[PDB]
Amino acid sequence: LKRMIAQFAPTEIKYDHSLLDERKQKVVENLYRAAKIMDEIFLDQVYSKNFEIREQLRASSDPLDQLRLEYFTIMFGPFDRLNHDKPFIGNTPKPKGANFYPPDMTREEFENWLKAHPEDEAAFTSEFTVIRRQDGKLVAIPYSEYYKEYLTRAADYLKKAAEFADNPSLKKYLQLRAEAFLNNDYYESDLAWMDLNDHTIEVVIGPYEVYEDKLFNYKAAFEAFITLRDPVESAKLKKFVGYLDEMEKNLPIPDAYKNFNRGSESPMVVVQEVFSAGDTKAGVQTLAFNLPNDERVREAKGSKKVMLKNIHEAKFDKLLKPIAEKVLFAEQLPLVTFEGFFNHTLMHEISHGLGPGKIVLNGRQTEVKKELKETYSSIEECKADVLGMYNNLFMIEKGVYPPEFEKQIYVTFLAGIFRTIRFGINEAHGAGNAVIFNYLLEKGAYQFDPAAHRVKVNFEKIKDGVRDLANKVLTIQAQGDYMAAKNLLETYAVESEPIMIMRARLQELPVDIKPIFQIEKELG
Ligand SMILES: N[C@@H](CCCC[NH3+])C(=O)O
Ligand SMILES: [Cl-]
Ligand code: NA
Ligand SMILES: [Zn+2]
């Protein structure tokens, strides 16, 4: 268990205290108390025995149980999220429905209930209800009622925080989100969250991501981000959203493929994380999130893309830098910079909003996601990473970035390929990185030394290689070419021998990070 815990390097998550006066301190304190309740709620959402298992580990005298508790705390359950939820306590497999559904309820019984009781479909499929067996029936119990005890205390902490919040947009959001916990309707407070302006505390708290529900991907998990907004860095990102049409017109495709029906633009903010809780804190840590998922909000006001700068700093120092030291030639190692890591994530997120979407295939109105089917996510993340380099090169052309940043782009991404791929080559993001590495290696844009076991950028072919792969992925999307998407993945999204060799060199490094929050040492 000592080595499994070592996969997450302990790192201290600190924040700038000078950004908060006395009254903002009391906001963050009460926001922290509500976020710790999100830790308790989500722990119950993962598995019904989580609280009972935690209590057994707490009272146990076995020194081995205290090591199992440390990994339990990391994973919010007895299942190893780095290894397909393999239980490290006992051997009972994790329910596919976590704790949102009865463990003996299949998809068939669920779908058979909605056929016999059509009136329950809106409540049963809702992101904010749990399914339970009662009196020979299946009932949908809203989150506001199933977790009323926790959410009432969490709402009171939000109400107390709102009294100390002098920023009107912040005060309004905290008040409405407090009510949202109890009336189970998060739409009005989601809109207030998108309207946060001229504020320091960038905070989001509530149920959002549905990826814990591995039965239907229906139910959302409670989580929290408490971050501090950075005006100097968020200002530098205000011009990137002004280049959105320019980046699209500049894409390496015929004009008929270029998409100016992309929908509402997303606001983007660079923040310093103070505390995270719930779904996001389990296992691997988030570098940036994109909320809300409500299409009703994303149509009206878009979604907010929040970049966690200090989490990037932790991952760069603990992971990307040690990986680059082992995978790159010494002459290219200095080109690995924090700017190359953080600014790619910025442009990776921007690039998701570019490229084909609503398309016409054989005269029918359709979508890239509908046509690519299971290949869409791998192709989409491949597009975002390739365009992230392409558009950052475009930002150099326009004087936004200095010329010496060009080589940092290529090299830092190459080093980052082998941080992402260690998470798993079958995931969409890892699959997309496998394509980029194997394709650019084939083109000669990357080079693998079979004796030194190191990779490098070929600066004479890397620019065209990125353009070539961008053209190919964008064209596959614009034509809805599911067959070419499959063949691209079958050919290049593979664990090639160079990848196997480089991966073997990194077995002793941490996989991710364990957050040790300064605020937890302050408020305890
Ligand atoms: N996006 C993370 C890995 C996945 C985290 C999912 N919550 C990273 O690049 O470090
Ligand atoms: Cl504020
Ligand atoms: Na996580
Ligand atoms: Zn992505």
Author numbering: 32 to 476, 477A, 478 to 555
Verbatim from the authors:
However, they enabled the recognition of five evolutionary conserved amino acid sequence regions in the M49 family, including the unique hexapeptide zinc-binding motif HEXXGH.
Similarly to the other available crystal structures of M49 family enzymes, the structure of CaDPP III consists of two structural domains, called upper (containing zinc ion) and lower domain, which are separated by the inter-domain cleft. The zinc ion, essential for the enzyme activity, is positioned in the lower part of the upper domain where it is pentacoordinated by two histidines from the first conserved, zinc binding, motif H379EISH, one glutamic acid (E442—bidentately) from the second motif E441ECKAD and a water molecule. Although CaDPP III has shorter first conserved motif, pentapeptide vs hexapeptide, there is no significant difference in the zinc binding site in these two orthologs. The crystal structure of CaDPP III is very compact and more similar to the closed B. thetaiotaomicron and human DPP III forms than to the open ones. The conformation of CaDPP III is partially closed, probably due to the Ala-Lys dipeptide bound into the protein active site. Since Ala-Lys was never added to the crystallization solution, we assume that it was bound into the inter-domain cleft during protein expression. However, the lower CaDPP III domain is 85 amino acid residues shorter and lacks the α-helix-loop-α-helix motif, two β-strands, and α-helix at C-terminus. The finding that the relative number of non-covalent interactions within CaDPP III is larger, while the share of loops (unstructured regions) is lower than in its mesophilic counterparts suggests higher rigidity and compactness of this enzyme, and gives possible explanation for its thermal stability.
